[PDB]
């Protein structure tokens, strides 16, 4: 009986592919290939944040564009005052294996997670003087890859046990479970309305979900390898995608298909982090070959090279005002350019 | 141009980084090892004098001049390519092989072939522990080892079978900067901490010689 259902699914996916093909008239070529080039972009080393004694695996910027959170394998979560190259807090972690970190938009909470399958939240503004654990969220059967804050009470985490979950910090329960993504969900990005988010996984799929619902609405496809990074456009209608096949793309929510792809012939290392500028014109992509090169989100052009990392870059971040970019590698030193 | 609050914030930062340096000095003298193997391959009883501290299991004990830490990495059913780079700076990888299970022997061989040629494990040495040798030698009369490993000749003795298994395990090694340490041990063998200590100090000496341009 499953043969008829499989045939119906094959007919539906053939119709979907035909619809994407027929909607792909006046395509990515010669629609954005009519404007001026971005030019030459060179960023000098303004800051070199030091203080970790292990590999930095994550980094998130504050919404004041003043404070950073870097969580590393040494069991330490240092909160950095970037304007003066300064340390504000140092939170000893119970489990040193960490693959993600978050910063609440209010500036009050930071999140952390890793191979302990626990998203542990921390409270910075306390009337005791030190950062304490506020709640330990457990219930996944796999490691957590990326956590992003919606407000002071709701967290959404992407984990490697083929699921994503939205929690509430007060009671520590999974309000919404986002089933799908047969591979391991490896990244997550929030649109600038706290309503819809994207999530890539190892099974080469970039689904789009809704927070107020519990199901997908657009399943982008087209990568031939693993995914590692994802990032929305400032409009809220597009997103980028970094992957293990040295291929960073731009996708389109309205068209339900794939816009221009910025890949290079000589590059073979995987992409670990992608990020967008304030206007969305400049895309910064991390690279596993000890480098982090910039591109253009409209045309294919290597506008510049940001070099200086002794090890692999695993976290890249652009502030809300877009004033500075943070680049963190496994050399225990993370850099801020201009 | 610095204010009073700025000065006291700089002092707080100095205290934070001094405590960070103290913690890094304290934690550098701990040997980190990565236990591996098949299901029920003797990982839970590698050392009978260990204290235990889910995603992964961490167990620690102290022997002579060094403090040991073991990562069982059990229950991590996810893809074994996304969190291996977390365990890239381990000094040694303890692989446990159970000679008793003939069905799961090829699973252990496949795992050994996977981990001994990974990009993150090109330099990390491996301390083999051919566990469960007593009942293996007890059952070596009925089973001649050719039911699971063909293309060999021998007297179906314990020594030759152990040598053949060890040779098959070392045949999956393709690296000029790594040495596999093999040590047959019993389930009643209390002498396991000294084997790991000798192997680990030999590994550290070998790594120091490698880094200086020597062997």
């Amino acid at each position: 009986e499953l043969d008829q259902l499989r045939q119906e699914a094959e007919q539906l996916k053939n119709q979907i592919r035909d619809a994407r093909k027929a909607c792909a008239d006046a395509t990515l070529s010669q629609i954005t290939n009519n404007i001026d080039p971005v030019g030459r972009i060179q960023m000098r080393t303004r800051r070199t944040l030091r203080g970790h004694l292990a590999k930095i695996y994550a980094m998130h910027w504050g919404t004041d564009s003043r404070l950073l959170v870097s969580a590393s394998q040494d069991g330490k979560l240092i909160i950095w005052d970037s304007y003066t190259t300064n340390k504000v807090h140092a939170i000893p972690l119970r489990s040193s294996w960490v693959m993600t970190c978050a910063y609440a938009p209010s500036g009050n909470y930071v999140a952390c997670g890793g191979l302990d399958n626990i998203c542990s939240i921390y409270n910075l503004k306390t009337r005791e003087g030190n950062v304490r654990v506020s709640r330990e969220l457990a219930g996944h059967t796999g490691y957590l890859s990326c956590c992003r804050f919606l407000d002071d009470n709701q967290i959404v985490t992407s984990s490697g046990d083929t699921t994503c979950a939205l929690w509430d910090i007060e009671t520590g329960q999974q309000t919404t479970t986002f089933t799908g993504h047969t591979g391991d969900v490896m990244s997550l990005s929030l649109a600038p309305d706290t309503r819809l988010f994207v999530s890539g996984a190892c099974d080469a799929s970039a689904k789009l979900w809704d927070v107020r619902e519990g199901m997908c609405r657009q399943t982008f496809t087209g990568h031939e390898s693993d995914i590692n990074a994802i990032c929305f456009f400032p409009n809220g209608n597009a997103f980028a995608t970094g992957s293990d096949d040295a291929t960073c793309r731009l996708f389109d929510l309205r068209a339900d298909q794939e816009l221009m792809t910025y890949s290079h012939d000589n590059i073979i290392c995987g992409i670990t982090s992608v990020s967008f500028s304030k206007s969305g014109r400049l895309l910064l992509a991390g690279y596993d070959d000890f480098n982090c090169n910039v591109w253009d989100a409209l045309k294919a052009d290597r506008a510049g090279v940001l070099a200086g990392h002794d090890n692999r870059v695993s976290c890249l971040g652009v502030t809300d005002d877009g004033m500075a970019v943070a680049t963190g590698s496994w050399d225990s030193f993370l850099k801020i350019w201009n | 141009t610095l204010s009073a609050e700025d000065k006291a914030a700089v002092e707080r930062s100095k205290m934070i980084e001094k405590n960070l340096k103290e913690d890094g000095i304290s934690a550098a003298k701990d040997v980190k090892l990565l236990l591996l193997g098949a299901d029920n391959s003797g990982k839970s009883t590698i050392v009978k004098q260990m204290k235990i501290i889910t995603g992964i299991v961490e167990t620690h004990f102290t022997f002579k001049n060094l403090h040991f830490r073991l990562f069982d990495v059990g229950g991590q059913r996810s893809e074994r390519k996304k969190w291996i780079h977390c365990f890239e700076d381990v000094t040694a990888i303890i692989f446990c092989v159970d000679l008793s299970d003939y069905n799961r022997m090829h699973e252990s061989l496949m795992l050994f072939d996977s981990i001994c040629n990974n990009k993150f494990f090109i330099d990390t040495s491996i301390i083999l522990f051919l566990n469960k040798k007593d009942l293996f030698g007890e059952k070596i009369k009925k089973s001649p080892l050719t039911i699971c490993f063909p293309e060999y000749t021998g007297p179906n003795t314990y020594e030759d079978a152990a040598a053949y298994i060890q040779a098959q395990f070392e045949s999956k090694n393709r690296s000029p900067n790594k040495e596999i340490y093999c040590h047959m041990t019993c389930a009643t063998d209390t002498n396991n901490a000294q084997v790991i200590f000798d192997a680990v100090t030999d590994i550290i000496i070998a790594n120091n010689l490698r880094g200086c341009g020597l062997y």
Partner: single-chain antibody
Amino acid sequence: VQLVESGGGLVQPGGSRKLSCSASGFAFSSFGMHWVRQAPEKGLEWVAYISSGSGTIYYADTVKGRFTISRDDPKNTLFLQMTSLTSEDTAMYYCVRSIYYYGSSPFDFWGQGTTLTVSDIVMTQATSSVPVIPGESVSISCRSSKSLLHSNGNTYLYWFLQRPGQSPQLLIYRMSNLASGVPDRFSGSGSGTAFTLTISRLEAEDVGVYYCMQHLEYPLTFGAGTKLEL
């Protein structure tokens, strides 16, 4: 979180006393604790200071060479050892906690004082007997000998409310930042050497004396005090 200060009492004009205060509820080593005295019918005055981990110890002009401050971090106790007690030291001695990082709120908790009996920047604020009506717009002013703005973009001026029979409580820090637990009616604004606390819709539990503080140059300067009547 509660600070209890013990000791004090009568002393001969030339003797010595060693006041001590203890904390129970917050991490002591992360806070730079202060000593602030209050004459029985006058304003507040800064006395002593010790940093986190005893890394910096500052004294006042009337405190240098005569007093000393120490803290016992393992036992969570702050010590004030005073020598050559004159008759001008007859004051109630307050223990004040303070933390310093980006976004901190220094001088956010005060301990109940110790009555002692022995038998720069200049700031002068407003009037001292203003007729507060319950429910109004009251603009308590302040002044300074300098424009208290640094290159960091932070203007430093603190507002304290002393209820009758109670220790001072922080209301506004930096220049316009509400402290935690302060209701939204309290609001402050100003510029260099011109500061005003605009209290709108005055209510109960607001009568008392209002104080300023500078925190650019470290020897602390208060104001005389503006008192809300009725």
